[PDB]
């Protein structure tokens, strides 16, 4: 039996809030394809180390076997980087806040080949979140849902599904707590979950881009990032 399931909504929220990884910085050098992609993959690689340690703190995650933990992170890592990026960029309409000192716009996406398309998707998701007034507490639930959900069908399973339900309960809890009517609660739940489909889409496209970028042997990729990428076959 997993401790995750015994937690109350408030304990779930606090656990997730407390597990949050930090906002990392990029280089303090005040844009080519090589230079931009170099910064992004460097940043990604550093964020991945934090994400792996963040995931271990999502309730229910460590109760899984190591092999299942690897499977879920392998499936979800880019989605998780992306939703985090989108969340960070939410208060910056028209910009992607990769780091506090790397706040980019559509125009710079044109510099990397096949990047402006992904950029435009990221920006629209960010705008969507902003217009929905997405809250930090809702954000952390959504992010953990991605971690547990994305690889779950390419599979215990019940456990993951019970924990997923627990996070659903937690989301509704927050929406009730914010004073939303019943109908507003279920409509908002649906709206947020449907965005996860778009995040999957963006991850799939980003993965293709990363692969071509790997093949073009343009920027070096860490052995970690290469292993995470290779997992998507």
């Amino acid at each position: 039996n997993s401790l995750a399931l015994s937690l109350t909504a408030d304990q779930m929220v606090s656990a997730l809030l407390d597990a949050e990884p930090p906002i990392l910085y990029s280089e303090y050098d005040p844009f080519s394809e090589a230079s931009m992609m170099g910064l992004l993959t460097n940043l990604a690689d550093r964020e991945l180390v934090h994400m792996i340690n963040w995931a271990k703190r999502v309730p229910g995650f460590v109760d899984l076997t190591l092999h299942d933990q690897v499977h879920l992170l392998e499936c979800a890592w880019l989605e998780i980087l992306m939703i985090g990026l989108v969340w960070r960029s939410m208060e910056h309409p028209g910009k992607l806040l990769f780091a506090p000192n790397l706040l980019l716009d559509r125009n710079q996406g044109k510099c990397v080949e096949g990047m402006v398309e992904i950029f435009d998707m990221l920006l629209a998701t960010s705008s969507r979140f902003r217009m929905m007034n997405l809250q930090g507490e809702e954000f952390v639930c959504l992010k953990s849902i991605i971690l547990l959900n994305s690889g779950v069908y390419t599979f215990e399973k019940d456990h993951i599904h019970r924990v997923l339900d627990k996070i659903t309960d937690t989301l509704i809890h927050l929406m009730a707590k914010a004073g939303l009517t019943l109908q507003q609660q279920h409509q908002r739940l649906a709206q947020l979950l449907l965005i996860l489909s778009h995040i999957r889409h963006m991850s799939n496209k980003g993965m293709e881009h990363l692969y071509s970028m790997k093949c073009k042997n343009v920027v070096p990729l860490s052995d970690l990032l290469l292993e995470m990428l290779d997992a998507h076959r």
Binding site: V49, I52, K56, L66, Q69, V70, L73, E74, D223, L224, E227, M228
Partner: peptide
Amino acid sequence: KILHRLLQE
């Protein structure tokens, strides 16, 4: 794999 080691560290 590196992930395995990091998940354990």
